[PDB]
Amino acid sequence: GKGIKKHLKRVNAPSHWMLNKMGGQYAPKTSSGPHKLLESIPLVILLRNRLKYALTFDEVKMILIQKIVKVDNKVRTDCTFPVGLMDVIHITKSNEYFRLLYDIKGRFVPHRITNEESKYKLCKVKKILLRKGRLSIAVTHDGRSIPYIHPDVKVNDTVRLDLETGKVLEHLKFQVGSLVMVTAGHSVGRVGVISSIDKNMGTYDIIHVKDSRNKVFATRLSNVFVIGDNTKPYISLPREKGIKLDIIEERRNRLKA
Amino acid sequence: RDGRHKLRLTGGKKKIHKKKRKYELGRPPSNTKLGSRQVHVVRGRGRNYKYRAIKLDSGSFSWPTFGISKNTRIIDVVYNASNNELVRTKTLVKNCIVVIDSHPFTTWYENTFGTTIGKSKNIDPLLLEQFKQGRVLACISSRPGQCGKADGYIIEGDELLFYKRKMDKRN
Amino acid sequence: DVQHERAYQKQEGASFFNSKRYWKKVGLGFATPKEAKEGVYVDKKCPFTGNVSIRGRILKGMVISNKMKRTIIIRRNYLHYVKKYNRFEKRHKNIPCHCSPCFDVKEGDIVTVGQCRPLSKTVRFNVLHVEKHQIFGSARKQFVLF
RNA sequence: AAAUAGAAAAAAGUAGGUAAGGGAAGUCGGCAAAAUAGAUCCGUAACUUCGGGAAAAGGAUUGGCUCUGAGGACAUUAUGUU
RNA sequence: GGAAAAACCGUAAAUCCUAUCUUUUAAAGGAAGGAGAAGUCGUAACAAGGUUUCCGUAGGUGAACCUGCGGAAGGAUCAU
RNA sequence: UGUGUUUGAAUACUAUAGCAUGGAAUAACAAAAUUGAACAAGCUAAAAUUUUUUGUUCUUAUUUUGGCUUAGUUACGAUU
RNA sequence: AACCUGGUUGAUCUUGCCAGUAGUCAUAUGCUUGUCUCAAAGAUUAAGCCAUGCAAGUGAAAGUAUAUAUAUAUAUAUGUAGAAACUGCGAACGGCUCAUUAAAACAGUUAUAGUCUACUUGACAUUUAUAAGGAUAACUACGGAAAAGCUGUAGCUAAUACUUGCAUUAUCCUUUUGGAUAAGUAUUUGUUAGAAGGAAUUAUAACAAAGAAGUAACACGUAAAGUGUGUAUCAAUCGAGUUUCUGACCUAUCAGCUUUUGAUGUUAGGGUAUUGGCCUAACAUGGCUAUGACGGGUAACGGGGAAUUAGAGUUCGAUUCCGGAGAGGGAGCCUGAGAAAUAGCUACCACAUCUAAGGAAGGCAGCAGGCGCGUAAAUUACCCAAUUCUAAAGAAGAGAGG
């Protein structure tokens, strides 16, 4: 009749995935969970198609059934569980820790994170609500509630967040001069510093961002994620660091290696 | 229910298309009368429950001057703003004017003020006479067919005068 | 006078037991009328003291009819591009819009209307500013472009 | 009062009625008989010399009771008498 | 509490009666148009084609046409 | 002696409308004298400030601000 | 590849057509086909009909075993497997067709401060007690019918089927400590106070009334104090309903349309999940129309797109993705979070099957295959290895898919 569509075709599925034309009829469809469908990776894609620790979906199932992999200090066998923009995967058996980051080619990549530094993540809040007794809960990009947050923090602030206790290590006020990562839009998968904020009334708030090649571009506010400060980047970016080379420059650079 | 089968904005005529769906939605009207409490639970989309009062006699009436509420029987339905048929047939709606038993309110006023928290500014003489004779006019404000209860407020002054004139060549 | 209808006219946010009306601030370049604050009326379809949400698009049109009770009709005239000839053609659209009883509205007034919440079948918009003006000849038959 | 009365009550006659199911199949012939019909409100074609056709066709309604509304005349400057 | 069964509003299939529109499709018979064969009767048009032509029109004609009326030259006159 | 390595899976079109956005030209439109509006002065009714007696209430007034009436004064005010 | 020849004549230049000529993931057909890789394939004609088969199920740490099988300990105890059956969850996706539907559906672009949302995810609760109350299926027996996924009695007995129910915090006094007092989340009513959003009747806080549901009487097992299943509210997510603006083929041998009968506005109600003439009453007398309304046509699903393109364009878009429609025709429901579902049901009409002629059951535009239609279209093949989906989710299923 009508209701929930449970399938995702190969062609229909996000270009970000890198699921090739001949390689199947379908893609995996994500469970509801940490991030939106278009803005996430399931464990099947991560294990097989990125890491290549399995040949097939069955070999992924053989890895998953075991107690070996834990994400957010939680063991998971759930194949289509979505891992979102930024969080820490630990695989106990291989002793491996991966932090999820955007590539410059607009796809999600697992970037190796230090064993100690696996403890924490940097987490953007999307909204912050007052519940009964005038009692705060923050609501995160990764779909988590952080209860009892101090009123100093505001609705676009990022926060460094422990994974063991689930609570805040430090926080960064949203402002001009903060290192920002673009998460959707035209400029998707790049890092810059906020050059200027101008309010838009009744309509989309736009933010001006400067690259580290000293080039300035606009981006919509909703899809800019604060990621560090002018003083320092707050987390371990991959080597590219969101910096834009043009195709001619990039291909010449590739050739000159 | 559906609007697409009705006439076009120009006054034009539109062919019937799309066979009827569940979620266009719309069901028979409430018939709620005066009698001992009886209600049927109605199951709406998503498992959302509504309560269909089929009979009631005692609703929650608010004396809004002190802002206080007590449960009280309605003696009669006396005027209805929407049409004369509903009041004559005795079917409640959220703009019926009913008559309530004044005794819980009368007791509360006596307890609070000591003659007949609290504002204590003295009730108007016409309204006070009406409370004394038990013929207290009140307006229904909840939707009994949706919420399972007919709850209302005690009317006064300009609302009282308007509805009294509405209630009753000649004068 | 008032209340010609079968029912008393009141609206939420009157608050006259405590007495410390429901007039709004409305936002987005529209300063709420003094005539809403001080006016004799009370209403729900008024955007300046009703329960109306002034949301979505904000458009301009030209008033063509004031005949209907509490509700007014605007024509939005515009030029449509034809690619093959690389040229334009006149097109236009009639929008029935709530009037607001605070205002005076006449034919050939410019009015800035909002998308808001529709409360009736053909009515869509609600006036946010009435820019008083006039035009020669019949407004319904007149082409004014802006 | 009719140029009579009474009593009986079948045929038959004559002026009448009424008939199940069918519905012109009877008979030269729907002849006879019946159906229809008054008002108010609707609706009305082919066709026409545009005047009509037309009450076309085809429909609906109609009691009793208790009210409601509309239509005058006079005389106090908005109110009365009738 | 509770089956069958009824009654009341409300959806409302289907059926039939009209009314209007739509689509093919039948029909005796009528009256046109074209194609074909070097067909019959004239000699109409083409040259002043042996009454210069054509137009509008009306009436006549076995026709082709003819005559009248009023135009034009696309006339044979662009010359007293 | 555990642990291969470099990777690639680019770039762009993706309405005409809508959204944000810089704009000088070119167009439009509005502003635009049967006398109009820019200012100084005075008179005037409205509100607020400062004052100020009366125990959980409570008087009045100067003053200051906004609205409106009237003689003056601007490089005062109409393209062909 | 930004282009032309031949055809009115005795000969001529033109107008103008016809003819060649090239293409077409566009079909048929004729003849020919030594090869290999690649791979469209019953749309156009009948949204005509179907024989037979199959296409949606599910149990490997965690509801229910005296059918049964099996390893240990003193017939019985622990345990471990287990046909079956209740229970739970899914089958609303997919696959198929395009009759429709022409400002509708659809596309870009809004809005939802007008709402609902299972699974999943993260927050995380308030008005007999060494742990409850039975009753019901499979099962045993007798049975009935030609036949059927027809089912009748009586005896039982479980559940994670069904029904109950078992001291915690804050405020005031004492001063830390020690006393006293209270105590409903959604949702609804009446009274107010008033973090954030442009905008607030929103968050939130108080009052007076009502008020669901609830907060584990369930199952496993980490010492080289752990876990499953399941539960109210809140938010997320997978979505969905509405809803703004702008965008269409042909037609005037269709010029006035719409309003009894909601047409158009207003008011009041009712209904709905919610806005809404969505539905009713009352009141207005509107509303829409050459910038072509209103009809009528379409060999009309809409879009991303396809063909030819020097540039404009012109023709085409059943048809691999998306959105809609539809499942013989209409209509109506049930179940559930989600269906007006159609391998759900009911009725009517159109079809149509078995009958022992009493009665009974039915829906290929799923995949094969057949019939009819036609100029026109493949095998009742094998498999779940990959791709994914459904479950008590590894190991089973899937004509999805290969």
Short mmCIF file of C-alpha atoms (C1' of nucleotides) in Angstrom, two decimals, chain B residues 1-30 42-48 50-52 60 62 64 67-71 81-83 86 93-95 117 141-147 149 151-153, chain G residues 99-105 116-117 186 188-191 207-212 239-242 257-259 262-264 268-274 276-282 287-288 293-295 298 300 324-327 329-333 335-341:
data_model
loop_
_atom_site.label_atom_id
_atom_site.label_comp_id
_atom_site.label_asym_id
_atom_site.label_seq_id
_atom_site.Cartn_x
_atom_site.Cartn_y
_atom_site.Cartn_z
CA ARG B 1 -12.12 14.52 4.05
CA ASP B 2 -10.93 15.23 0.46
CA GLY B 3 -11.24 18.62 -1.30
CA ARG B 4 -9.99 17.59 -4.77
CA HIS B 5 -13.45 16.34 -5.85
CA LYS B 6 -14.93 19.81 -5.09
CA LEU B 7 -15.12 22.67 -7.64
CA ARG B 8 -11.97 24.35 -9.02
CA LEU B 9 -11.00 27.90 -7.87
CA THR B 10 -12.27 29.35 -11.19
CA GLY B 11 -15.61 27.61 -10.55
CA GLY B 12 -14.46 24.93 -13.03
CA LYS B 13 -14.99 21.18 -12.83
CA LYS B 14 -12.19 18.70 -12.13
CA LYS B 15 -12.26 14.99 -13.04
CA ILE B 16 -12.24 12.38 -10.24
CA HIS B 17 -8.69 11.05 -9.75
CA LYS B 18 -6.99 9.07 -6.95
CA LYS B 19 -9.22 6.45 -5.27
CA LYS B 20 -10.16 7.31 -1.64
CA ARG B 21 -7.39 6.94 0.95
CA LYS B 22 -7.61 6.25 4.71
CA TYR B 23 -5.79 9.42 5.71
CA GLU B 24 -8.06 11.94 3.96
CA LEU B 25 -10.14 11.26 7.12
CA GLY B 26 -13.53 12.33 8.56
CA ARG B 27 -16.19 10.56 10.65
CA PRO B 28 -19.85 11.02 11.89
CA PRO B 29 -20.71 13.96 14.25
CA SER B 30 -20.97 13.75 18.07
CA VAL B 42 -11.79 6.19 19.22
CA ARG B 43 -8.56 5.05 17.54
CA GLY B 44 -7.02 7.72 15.26
CA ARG B 45 -4.03 7.34 12.90
CA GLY B 46 -0.71 6.46 14.64
CA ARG B 47 -2.72 4.98 17.57
CA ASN B 48 -3.76 8.49 18.67
CA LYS B 50 -9.81 10.42 21.13
CA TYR B 51 -12.63 10.06 23.63
CA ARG B 52 -16.20 10.26 22.26
CA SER B 60 -15.79 20.93 35.05
CA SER B 62 -14.72 27.45 36.08
CA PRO B 64 -12.96 32.70 36.27
CA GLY B 67 -9.88 31.32 38.62
CA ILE B 68 -11.20 28.22 40.40
CA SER B 69 -12.86 25.07 39.08
CA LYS B 70 -15.28 22.46 40.44
CA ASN B 71 -17.18 19.53 38.94
CA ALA B 81 -24.75 30.13 19.12
CA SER B 82 -24.36 27.91 16.01
CA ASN B 83 -28.03 26.93 15.53
CA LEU B 86 -28.87 21.63 18.72
CA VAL B 93 -21.10 21.92 21.60
CA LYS B 94 -18.27 24.34 22.59
CA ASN B 95 -20.55 27.40 22.19
CA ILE B 117 -6.07 32.68 48.45
CA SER B 141 -15.66 25.56 26.09
CA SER B 142 -14.18 22.05 25.62
CA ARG B 143 -15.11 19.79 22.66
CA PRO B 144 -16.87 16.72 24.29
CA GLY B 145 -16.77 14.70 21.04
CA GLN B 146 -12.98 14.95 20.94
CA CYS B 147 -11.86 15.10 24.59
CA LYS B 149 -15.71 15.88 28.65
CA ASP B 151 -16.09 21.66 30.60
CA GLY B 152 -17.04 25.34 30.71
CA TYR B 153 -16.94 28.77 32.30
"C1'" A G 99 -5.96 2.98 -18.01
"C1'" U G 100 -6.16 7.52 -16.14
"C1'" U G 101 -5.21 12.21 -14.56
"C1'" A G 102 -4.06 18.72 -18.66
"C1'" A G 103 -3.04 23.72 -13.47
"C1'" A G 104 -4.62 18.63 -11.04
"C1'" A G 105 -0.39 14.77 -11.01
"C1'" C G 116 1.56 12.32 12.83
"C1'" U G 117 5.50 8.99 12.81
"C1'" A G 186 1.37 13.07 28.04
"C1'" U G 188 -7.80 18.79 28.23
"C1'" U G 189 -10.15 23.01 30.72
"C1'" G G 190 -10.29 27.85 33.32
"C1'" U G 191 -6.78 31.64 35.65
"C1'" C G 207 -2.64 28.58 40.43
"C1'" A G 208 -7.81 25.57 40.38
"C1'" A G 209 -10.02 21.43 38.16
"C1'" A G 210 -10.08 16.90 35.43
"C1'" G G 211 -6.82 13.12 33.23
"C1'" A G 212 -4.45 8.42 29.72
"C1'" G G 239 9.67 8.96 6.78
"C1'" A G 240 4.69 10.99 5.65
"C1'" G G 241 0.41 14.03 5.19
"C1'" U G 242 -0.69 18.71 4.01
"C1'" C G 257 -18.69 30.62 -16.81
"C1'" U G 258 -19.56 29.34 -11.39
"C1'" U G 259 -24.11 30.02 -7.15
"C1'" G G 262 -20.72 25.39 -0.87
"C1'" A G 263 -20.02 28.58 -5.93
"C1'" U G 264 -17.16 33.17 -3.30
"C1'" A G 268 -20.60 30.05 14.69
"C1'" G G 269 -20.11 25.09 15.30
"C1'" G G 270 -18.91 19.89 14.02
"C1'" G G 271 -15.50 16.45 11.98
"C1'" U G 272 -10.31 15.21 11.10
"C1'" A G 273 -4.05 13.33 12.91
"C1'" U G 274 -3.97 18.57 11.93
"C1'" G G 276 -8.94 23.54 5.56
"C1'" G G 277 -16.80 24.49 2.78
"C1'" C G 278 -13.42 19.05 4.81
"C1'" C G 279 -18.99 19.03 6.96
"C1'" U G 280 -23.51 21.71 9.07
"C1'" A G 281 -26.32 26.06 10.40
"C1'" A G 282 -26.73 31.37 10.03
"C1'" G G 287 -15.83 34.62 -7.21
"C1'" C G 288 -13.37 33.39 -12.05
"C1'" A G 293 -11.71 31.53 -18.49
"C1'" C G 294 -15.32 27.74 -19.06
"C1'" G G 295 -15.69 23.53 -22.02
"C1'" U G 298 -4.92 14.14 -27.10
"C1'" A G 300 -1.52 12.69 -22.78
"C1'" G G 324 2.43 9.93 -8.99
"C1'" A G 325 -1.48 6.78 -10.42
"C1'" G G 326 -3.49 1.49 -10.80
"C1'" A G 327 -3.98 -3.88 -9.46
"C1'" G G 329 -15.06 -2.24 -12.38
"C1'" G G 330 -16.85 1.02 -8.51
"C1'" A G 331 -17.76 1.05 -3.09
"C1'" G G 332 -16.93 -0.18 1.93
"C1'" C G 333 -14.35 -1.75 5.86
"C1'" U G 335 -5.66 -5.38 10.95
"C1'" G G 336 -1.66 -2.48 12.16
"C1'" A G 337 3.01 2.51 13.43
"C1'" G G 338 2.26 2.59 8.38
"C1'" A G 339 -2.75 -0.04 3.61
"C1'" A G 340 -9.00 2.82 1.86
"C1'" A G 341 -3.72 -3.02 0.83
#
